[PDB]
Every structure is written in structure tokens, then in C-alpha cells.
Amino acid sequence: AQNPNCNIMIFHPTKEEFNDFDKYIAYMESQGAHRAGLAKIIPPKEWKARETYDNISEILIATPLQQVASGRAGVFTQYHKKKKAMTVGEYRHLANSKKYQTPPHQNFEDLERKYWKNRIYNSPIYGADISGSLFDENTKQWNLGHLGTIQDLLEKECGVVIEGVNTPYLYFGMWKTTFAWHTEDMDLYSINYLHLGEPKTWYVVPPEHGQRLERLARELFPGSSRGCGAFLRHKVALISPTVLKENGIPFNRITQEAGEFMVTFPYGYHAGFNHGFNCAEAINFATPRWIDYGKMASQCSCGEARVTFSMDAFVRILQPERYDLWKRGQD
Numbered sequence: 001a002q003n004p005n006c007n008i009m010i011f012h013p014t015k016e017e018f019n020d021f022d023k024y025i026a027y028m029e030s031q032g033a034h035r036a037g038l039a040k041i042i043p044p045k046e047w048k049a050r051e052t053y054d055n056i057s058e059i060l061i062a063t064p065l066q067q068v069a070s071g072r073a074g075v076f077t078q079y080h081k082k083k084k085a086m087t088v089g090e091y092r093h094l095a096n097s098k099k100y101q102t103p104p105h106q107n108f109e110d111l112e113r114k115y116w117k118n119r120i121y122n123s124p125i126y127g128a129d130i131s132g133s134l135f136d137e138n139t140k141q142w143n144l145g146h147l148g149t150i151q152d153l154l155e156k157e158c159g160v161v162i163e164g165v166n167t168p169y170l171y172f173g174m175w176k177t178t179f180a181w182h183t184e185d186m187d188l189y190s191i192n193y194l195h196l197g198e199p200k201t202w203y204v205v206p207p208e209h210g211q212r213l214e215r216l217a218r219e220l221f222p223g224s225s226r227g228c229g230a231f232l233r234h235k236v237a238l239i240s241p242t243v244l245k246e247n248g249i250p251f252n253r254i255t256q257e258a259g260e261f262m263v264t265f266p267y268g269y270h271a272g273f274n275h276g277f278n279c280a281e282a283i284n285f286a287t288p289r290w291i292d293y294g295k296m297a298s299q300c301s302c303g304e305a306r307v308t309f310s311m312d313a314f315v316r317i318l319q320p321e322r323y324d325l326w327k328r329g330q331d
């Protein structure tokens, strides 16, 4: 069995290997990359996402979200307070302001220490989940706006035609902006490209151990757990690496830099934070190996999680027994 310790692997495809996306994901899994829950893909040196980022300031962040924490430094929740719209240019200025800028630090490890010590005492502002793409239309390889759709995959594998579309999202981050412990909708894969700016640190639990994380989460967030049997789907809970280690939860960590892709694999719980002003693009996708995960994905039916139009058909076809209760949660 490849990669039995579930380490995060880093891949360096050649330009030729970068042509066929599906093939390369299949290659990565042949070498055991999925066991980690997360992989890093460094594009060939010949490749570019687009010519420059000089013209992005007029993009609008319609609903910036201020991320307010409650709890203790290593175990906390966050809620998203809606703020007034601003442009990417206005947002970058805010990120670079004294109130929000990255502090002086020695290296990534120092900055990680400062993040876990001090995150709860600030409320950074995140531009998340903005429908759109920064890939040039002429970029033919690993263009996140031109991937095969999840609906087509399900069609190809299972023969059923379904409604729905699948498009990318832009994330504009600053220091301390945070992504809570989660798996993807329907335990899908995700792919994330860091277009520009400061790094993003990731933490990930191997899919084969995700239930160990869930059991700890229920212990650490007991009221949340009583309200919903899948409350990690709410995407509000944070647990530090120090707390994971104290409770024996297997996990790994890696920092993503500008120009790099990260792939998250089905049922790979992940969480993380941004180092300073950045812009990432991400999209869910599927492979044939996903189908089994999709059939077994937990669902939030308490009403909090509230998700895209396109998840209806996934639940309807893969999880018909759950469908009625889950849709009541949606409505």
C-alpha cells in the first residue's frame, strides 16, 4: 500500500504531464497521495495562469465577512458578520493597514505560532465565495474554469442526467482570515490555486481517520453536536494543532505559496489560515473513485449548512433515503 503513513505529497508534473487533468489525479492516487487528504502540485515552469494581476482591483467583493471568534485560543468557533461591499483594491488597502497587516515575524513557523496564540483577539475580514475566475481563457492546462463538471461525471459513471452547474469561486484573504474544519459538500474533491500574494497554511486529517476528528469535535463543541449530527458542515469550528496532538488526532500541515495548487481528496477534513493579502481560486470536482464517498457523505439537515442549488441532485440520486429530510433542512 502506497503512502501508509498518510503524508502530504508534493508533485512536480512536466508540461507534458500537465495536459490531461484526470490522468494526473489518477497518477497521484496511484502513488498514495489521497491517503493524506491533501496534495501540493507545483506547475511546470513553462505554465502560467494568466499574463499579470495588474488589472484586478475593480473586482467587487459584494459581501465581505468579518470573522468573529468565541472560545479559547486553541478551540473556538467563528461567525461571519456581513460588511458593506468594497472593491478588491479597497480590500487590499484594508489588509495592508496597521489594524490588519501581518506582524513582523521570522519565518512561517513563527507566524503559525502567532496565529494560534492571537487569532481569537482579532476579527479579520474575508472576501469569500465570490463566483468567478482569474484564469486566462487561453490557459489550456489546469484551468479551474474548464474542468469537467461533476454532473457530467455522475452521468458518465451512473447513467443519470441531472440539472446543475459547477463553477469556480474566488477568495480574497488577509492575515488571520480562517477556514474552519470541514470536508467538501458531498465529500467532493477540491482544487485550490493561489493566484497571488501571501501564503495559506493548511491542516488536514487523513480520510481514513476523519471519524476521529468528528468524535473530538463532538466532545469540544457539545451544544453544537446536540443541535446537529453533522455540525462540521456549518464550517464554524477551529481546533489547533496543539489540541489535535494532545488528543492523538492524526493530521499533517503544509504551507501553500503563490503559484501552487492544492488538491483536497474525498472526506479529507481540512482547516487553515492566510498569512496576509492574497487571492485564491477554488472549485469542487469529482472522479470515479468519489462516487462511493458521495453515497456515504453525512448531511446537515438542521438548517444551518444551506448549500448550492446543484447539491440537490447529488443527494436526490446518491442518497434517496436522506433526500426528504435533507431538503426540509434546505427550505
Ligand SMILES: O=C(O)CNC(=O)C(=O)O
Residues within 6 Å of the ligand: 171, 178, 179, 190, 191, 192, 264, 270, 280, 282, 283
Ligand atoms: O481557501 C479557503 O479559504 C478555503 N478553501 C478550501 O477549503 C478548499 O479549497 O477546499
Ligand SMILES: [Mg+2]
Residues within 6 Å of the ligand: 055, 056, 057, 058, 059
Ligand atoms: Mg478589475
Ligand code: NI
Residues within 6 Å of the ligand: 182, 183, 184, 190, 264, 270
Ligand atoms: Ni475546502
Ligand SMILES: [Zn+2]
Residues within 6 Å of the ligand: 227, 228, 229, 230, 231, 233, 234, 300, 301, 302, 303, 304, 305
Ligand atoms: Zn446542521
